[PDB]
Design a protein around this ligand. Sequence first.
Ligand SMILES: CCCCC/C=C/C/C=C\CCCCCCCC(=O)O[C@H](COC(=O)CCCCCCCCCCCCCCC)COP(=O)([O-])OCC[N+](C)(C)C
Lengths: 86, 164, 340, 86, 117, 135, 469
Amino acid sequence: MFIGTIILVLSFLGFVFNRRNIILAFICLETMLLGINLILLRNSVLFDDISGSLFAIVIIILAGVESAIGLSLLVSYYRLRGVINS
Amino acid sequence: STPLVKTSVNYSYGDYPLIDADPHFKRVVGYMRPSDYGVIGLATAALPAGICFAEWLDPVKGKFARPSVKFLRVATMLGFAVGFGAAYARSSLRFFGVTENAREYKKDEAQMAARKAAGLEPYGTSSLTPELQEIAAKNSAHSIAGLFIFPWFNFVNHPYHGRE
Amino acid sequence: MIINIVEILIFLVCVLFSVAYLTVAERKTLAYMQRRLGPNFVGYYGLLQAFADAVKLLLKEIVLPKESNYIILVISPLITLITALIGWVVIPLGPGITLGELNLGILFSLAIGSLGVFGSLLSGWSSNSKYSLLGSIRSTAQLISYELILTSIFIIIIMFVSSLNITTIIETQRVVWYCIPLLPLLLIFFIASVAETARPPFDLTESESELVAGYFTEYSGSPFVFFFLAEYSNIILISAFNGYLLLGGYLSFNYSYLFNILFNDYSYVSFLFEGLINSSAYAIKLVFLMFSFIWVRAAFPRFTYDNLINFCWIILLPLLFGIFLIIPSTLYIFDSFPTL
Amino acid sequence: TAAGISLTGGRNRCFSEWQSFMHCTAKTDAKSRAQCLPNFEDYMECLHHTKEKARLREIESVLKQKKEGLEAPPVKVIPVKAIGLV
Amino acid sequence: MNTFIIFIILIPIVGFALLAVNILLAVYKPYNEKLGAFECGLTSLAFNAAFILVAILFLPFDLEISTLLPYVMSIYLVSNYGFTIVLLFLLILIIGFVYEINTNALKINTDSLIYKL
Amino acid sequence: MMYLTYYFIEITIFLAILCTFIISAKNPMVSILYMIALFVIAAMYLYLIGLGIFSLLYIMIYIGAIAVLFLFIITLLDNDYNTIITQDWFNIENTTLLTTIGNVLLTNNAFILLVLAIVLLLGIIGPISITMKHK
Amino acid sequence: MLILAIISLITFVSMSKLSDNRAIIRLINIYLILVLVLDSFLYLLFLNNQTYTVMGELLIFNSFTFYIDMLIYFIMIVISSLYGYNLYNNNLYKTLFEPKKELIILFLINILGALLIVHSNDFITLFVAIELQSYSIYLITAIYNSSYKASKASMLYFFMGGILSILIAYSINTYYSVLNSYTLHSLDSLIINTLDLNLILIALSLGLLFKIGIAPLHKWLISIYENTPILITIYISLIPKISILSYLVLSNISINSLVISILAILTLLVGSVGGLLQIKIKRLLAFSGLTNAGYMMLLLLLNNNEFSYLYYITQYSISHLAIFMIIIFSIYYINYINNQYNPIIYVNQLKGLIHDNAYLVLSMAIVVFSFIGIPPLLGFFGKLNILMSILNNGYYFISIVLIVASLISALYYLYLLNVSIQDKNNILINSNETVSSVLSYILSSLIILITFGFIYNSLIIDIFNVYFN
Ligand SMILES: CCCCC/C=C/C/C=C\CCCCCCCC(=O)O[C@H](COC(=O)CCCCCCCCCCCCCCC)COP(=O)([O-])OCC[N+](C)(C)C
């Protein structure tokens, strides 16, 4: 609940107040998903319930495919411009 | 083949008596009427006839040309799939007691009586454990409702058929 | 605490010296396949050759090029070496005889392996020599592609055992080694372990003729020692994965009759004799595998990047998905789903 | 659904009172539903241990406000190595 | 403090010790010509789609392979039911693999001479 | 020694705050390496709460694949009380977290699995569709 | 059928050449038509409002979701026709409207995602369907990668959708942490009285609603709608709205919510006021969509909203398709094509269209006056049902604001007709070219529906009373 919450909020603030780069943006997305999942898994353990962990696995997989698609979008964006000035 | 959970008995999905709440794939295909085969044939003819008529109305490249054999073969394949889905749905709806089902009801009564005479289980013996049978039932029950989205069938010999 | 320390020192010394002598064994074997002698002069019969190279490289100046991130250039070899050595903590030399007896031993092996592409991915960025960059991108591509094949064979084997404890996987093979029913899978694991290790014929990553040296063009002294050590330690470790997945690990033969003849009760003598038998079986399997790495290096010319990518993604991966389909089908047909 | 399944495939930590509460909601109707509010507090209680933590708070508070000695068979903490010693 | 954790701690210490021995014993004389990057002895960026594509398609296929870990750890408990489910899962993924093959996704002067007489 | 394992949870939390160095990194690479460090801290915390298998899956996937892709691409482009732990003997099987996840995912939620198959199918078709120029 | 179509289509599009795109799309168009007509009889399952839980209580099937499903198929049929058939056979239109190779598969997968959102009975299914739709719609935004604006649009869309998806996942997990459950079905009147779930449920609703672009987070979506190819905008502006709104209506987790009340008010005001100063056609239409999304958001504050919502969503889908198709047809008579992704951009480019095509302007007038809500067009009855619902439930101030917002939005609705019935100097003399029969027939069918739907109102309410009571 603590580590996950702080990763979520700090990654969110990094995303919003980013005025440095787009890679920071990707990373904040990924780390937010991380924090969500950590909160989820702690709750799973405290309840001795499997639904929490099942949803954690599904988040893992969907974050994988989301990263794949997002990087593909970034590459297609780059193909036209040659440079990412953020 | 002893149920682990309680089910409704002879529940009315419609105006007609219930034959089977979750019929087995073999029964649903086995109870299909000649009209359902007509539906399958109509879809199988309609889909390539549809592509040809569409080409007639608005040719792809200005000048009319009959669609190639690859596309027509595709057309027949997918049309048969749609027809079979429609026909399966019609038969299952008969089983639930939503459409008229006198013929199917009588045939089921006879088949069940014969099976009981032979000493067999009314719904067959399953290679699964009862827990997996309840899970298969809860996964296949009323799955015909999502025919538009995904195809799902009952292939498991479970005892939750909603009868007495 | 003391016993733990002694076990770790014994195991660590054996692993480090085995890696050191694998280099000498490679030079000597290639030499005799090339009608020559190889190292026979530094130490008796060339047995101190590896330590000579070591000492020299530890006395060599470290050069940090001008455009380089020196921290990354020095730490990348260090992390690849650490992971290559950490991978050894789960390898058993007998039933339960390992530093780490994890119920997730297989998952640990795969994870620490997946931590193995970071040296290649990072050095090109650290060196900044252009040859290093080309080598680094091509290597990262090749390594991940063949890691897929290795993970898929891992999964196919666990289909037979339903356990992630390495000792259990080995014990299930007393009935038969898994390389007998799955001989084609054993061939693919070799072809892929060669590629995943970046050895010839698949040495495109650091091939001297296409690219001078490779990603290591800029690595002198101890960083070069680390890349070298990590490479040979990974060779031995992936031969270990092969050994316990497919060659029955530390199983050789049923020595129950023999022990009942020799001994009449349990004793430290008999426990030691059993330990030596199991460890000898596992080490002879490791030796045949290392010899095969050297043999293949001696026999074949290199692939090109396009060739190996085509291989992995068009010839190997379809076959592996086909096997994914056909192994559980055979289990289902004969009602032999393995229990936990 | 995976509701009710523990991390080991059994029944989770808080299954029994959840199942009691469902027995309620099955037997009762919307007008009568308030009739087993009690089963629901029991469920939330198993889940979050709130009244239990409050009761422990009052017990600790009064314990630390006491200078008189305690004469009751006590609780002893031992090292893990010392399980079964003596 | 079992053998596992002690070994895990011990390995990086050995790495750092070798590094420190190198730093302590080796000479260190940098100068501009030595610090230059080596490219065959003398001082001196578009890429193809398949470079991007190998890396990007690694992630879905890795996820597919690692999605079978729960299956192989529960094969007996899921019986002939889970068996069928995992066949369907595998075939659905095989379709995407077929698409990849047929589109040739990872792959990177014959005119005649005619005289106007 | 005992305060070590006691505060181990609080240490991972502190290192996670510190590592979230990701935002302030001068170099995006360096930012990605610090992201990897954050993921290792996450794996450490997961083991502590009892979910080590998840520590290993996280190492396998997020570091083994997602961080590898990140780096590939960017090289290319320009509550003070204590809980009572009690025993009971009703579990005779060797059922762990992975086995239970397999059980529920492949039987109770086969539908979620097949929909995930479609999602991975998307994760294949899409990148090909937008990164490759046909004909 | 939809899964089978997706699988087959992947196989074919793999094995077909780039010239076969339109023939493939015609094939799927006819297949969807065949499914819609042959499998329609499954409505009979839903007699007496019978509800079915399916797939182990993951999916829920009732008359409402069956209707939303049919509507989504009808929309997909119409949208695929625009790609499967050429307006004109000249070179210009081959350049203007060519379907990408994978576009149809992306369309079908996004439709599958939308249907799974509608039917979702459990939060895991909701989240997976949301992510499926979100990913497919990112890719549809990005598939026309020759456009600078389309790529920029896809990236902005990726990031905003990712943040909203994280808000949604956080809401789902907080609900889990409080109730150890993933289903709303576990909720009851007793539970809502006992526990304060308002914060969690409103966060979930807001995370879903900001994905269809309600104020004050509108502008990113309007920019995306502006910057995409026109035939892409016809799709991405509609399907997500339908799926998300239908899910929220079916779930009823924000009844009498003060925050939703304030946000619906704000959305009405911003959609009406902000569209006034617009000069680009698609930005005008996007602000139209924002105002209409406000009208539908109002229905999330009350129970028994099924009839009003279904009527409104159907008539809105028809009007939206029709207005986009009219803008598409009016392309043949413009004298300047701006670029190959968005041929017409400014409202003033329609000036004098009545002199080129009188009946196109007749259709335009009909659809515009439907949007304003002039009886007896469908738009009037949609607004009438909405007002009936909200006044029955005591939303007096919101009703006054709805009146005012419809008045204000009439101005930029009539802007289109105003410039369209003005006069242009160079008036078409003649042409041999014929607009494609199929699309003209479809546009005509939509127009006739909007015009003469009201004759079936009493029959519709009679049917509704037996399938939803
Ligand atoms: C031969 C099979 C062809 C059927 C294909 C249907 C395609 C749907 C495509 C688009 C939706 C377009 C209009 C839907 C009509 C609602 C039917 C209904 O009555 O709505 C009720 C529910 O009322 C509602 O909530 C309100 C609906 C809001 C409608 C707004 C538009 C009103 C004006 C339309 C006038 C109709 C034109 C006739 C011209 C001669 C559902 O009825 P139901 O669920 O029992 O299914 C009907 C039985 N069926 C499956 C065989 C067809």
